[model samples]
Target chain A: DLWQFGQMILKETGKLPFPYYTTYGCYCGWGGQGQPKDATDRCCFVHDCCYGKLTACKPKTDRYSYSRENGVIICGEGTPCQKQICECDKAAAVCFRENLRTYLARYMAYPDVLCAVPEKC
Target chain B: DLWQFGQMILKETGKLPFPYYTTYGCYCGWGGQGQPKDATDRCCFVHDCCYGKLTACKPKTDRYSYSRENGVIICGEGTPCQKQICECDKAAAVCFRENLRTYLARYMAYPDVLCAVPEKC
Candidate 1:
């Protein structure tokens, strides 16, 4: 399901277009594996989204001090390491959640999406 | 399914228990919706974990700046505004994502927990 041709290429002005509907194409899902160096903002709700791009990757440590493994990092030797406390990288998360939600928001329309409700109906 | 009895109360002095196996009960799902005012760290993969607590809540403006509608806020008038740019609360997100992953990590085991991976296996 990785959109091989998908990529959210900026318009050279470095501004994401309005709305995440059909016209908004930021589909660089680790599958397309093509984005500018500065385009570090990322979002992944599906597979690694980092998938097809790891062709040059070294290895994975799969380690974390306290926090969960989130790929929002500079990506160096043993980098993208886990946080010591239960925390998240605030800035990186915006891109991650933004695009992730853009993709998933449509799920809210489907009855199959069963998220646990807090208040009872 | 909201564990009405579930609550991850700190041991007075404040320390979350180790491992999310059994005795780890941060279950203030929007259903049970009972947590200390200071226990601001929140995570809700299901329904609004803020559910039961809204009895004292005034109303939701459903407003945000640039960022999406994440339920991490002090809850005031139009308080949870969106970010003008794509940004995440690096500190608050840790609490949100931490508890959320703790709740969701277990679900990863289920076959139905389908997340798209980037790299092809």
Candidate 2:
């Protein structure tokens, strides 16, 4: 059976914590050097689909600081507050560190060039 | 404000399609029955958490038939075929119809009793 179609997109916005489990912590397989010997072959199943209510925030060990104005300033995890918020617009935050599985493998491989608007301007 | 925690667990051994989106599709807070007044009140994200080797079956347009002796005889989407498998123990598959959402809700609330053996038996 030939079936291979994958998609997962959560660019920005927050609120993701409900039994989320994705443990392939290392990446590129286990030990290293082209690992993929099975054992579920490097698993990845972090589902929740961003929950409901326009992305309701969860996951809080807290240490969310931001720049370019200010967006998130959730402290508590290791709390060292430095508040700053001016309407964060650092060139649209520039990928903003790219999480959630590298932004779903760069928007499922060049989804109309990710978000365009960055031609060395 | 403190946030609530939630989790999801896949009990069955089927593969889910990726980039799957879930519409409210007639749930609470819609059209009738004490609908919440918020537009963002009803929605669920179906992320691709069940990827990797252990569960690597993508959604193909097929009409899979099954029985008590055979397993799955997937024929196209509208194809008609009957097959049976003798392995799937009914007891373990009692809640097989509960989709990803229902399952999550039950598991998160109970934490440990989701899969306890039925007491009637």
Candidate 3:
């Protein structure tokens, strides 16, 4: 039921097919060998498997920092820049970033991948 | 922006001033001194303070088992009972209980208490 409701919300907000890049990790953060690179490493694949396909994508730039305090992700040159907050829970991790276009395209794609799973008998 | 959208949805769903008991702990499971007893011990108070007031209340009985698999709180005598599912996230904890009437009445009340917090100058 909750999933259905969430799906409905996703549909209404135009977030369904939420995007792939947003659900995955971003390379924007510090990168180095063994430090975890790319968007796939940090984000939760399990959650993406669940609701990722029902959302859309947005983009992020280096302007804004993806911190826990801001509550939403954005792109800007300074600590706070072009703010386009997304309705993500505090625990949403990368999905909270301001530039949602890029995030959704990469990370949220997992759901679409999983759609091939056969339904239970 | 997300909070505003969430508030708007709450208003649309008539969930404003969400209840308190749903966000707090519920005493349906095994209990002991350190094991935790009663509500308010297990639930996340910080989240309750944030979105607790924008909802309503519901009740639970001893008919269903509040297990992770069910993904919702319910009242029944055994593993399955009268199913009245609530729209709660998989990580919602006790808020997943199917009997939202009582849950909201209890844990969801926290929002009202926090309303007294003074606005920023």
| Second chain alone, TM-score for each candidate | 0.23, 0.19, 0.21
The sequence of per-residue lDDT tens digits that candidate 2 reaches over residues A1-121 is 0010111111132322111211122221111212222222122211111111212232111123432225432222322221111111111122222343433321111212223221110
Give me the chain B TM-score of candidate 1.
Answer: 0.23
CAPRI grade of model 2: incorrect
Give the DockQ of candidate 3: 0.02
For model 3, what is the error of residue A89's alpha carbon versus the real structure, in angstroms, after optimal superposition?
A: 10
Report how far residue A15 has shifted in candidate 1, in Å.
Answer: 14
**Cα miss at B64, model 3 (Å)?**
37
Tens digits of per-residue lDDT for model 3 on A7-105? 322333345311222222322111111222233333323233333333332211112223323533233333221222122211233333323433433
Q: How many Å off is the CA of A4 in candidate 1?
A: 26
Best by lDDT: 3
Number of the candidate with higher lDDT, 1 or 3 = 3
Residue A54's C-alpha lDDT in candidate 3?
Answer: 30
Model 2 C-alpha lDDT per residue in residues B74-111, reported as the tens digit of each score? 22232221111111112112223234334332111121
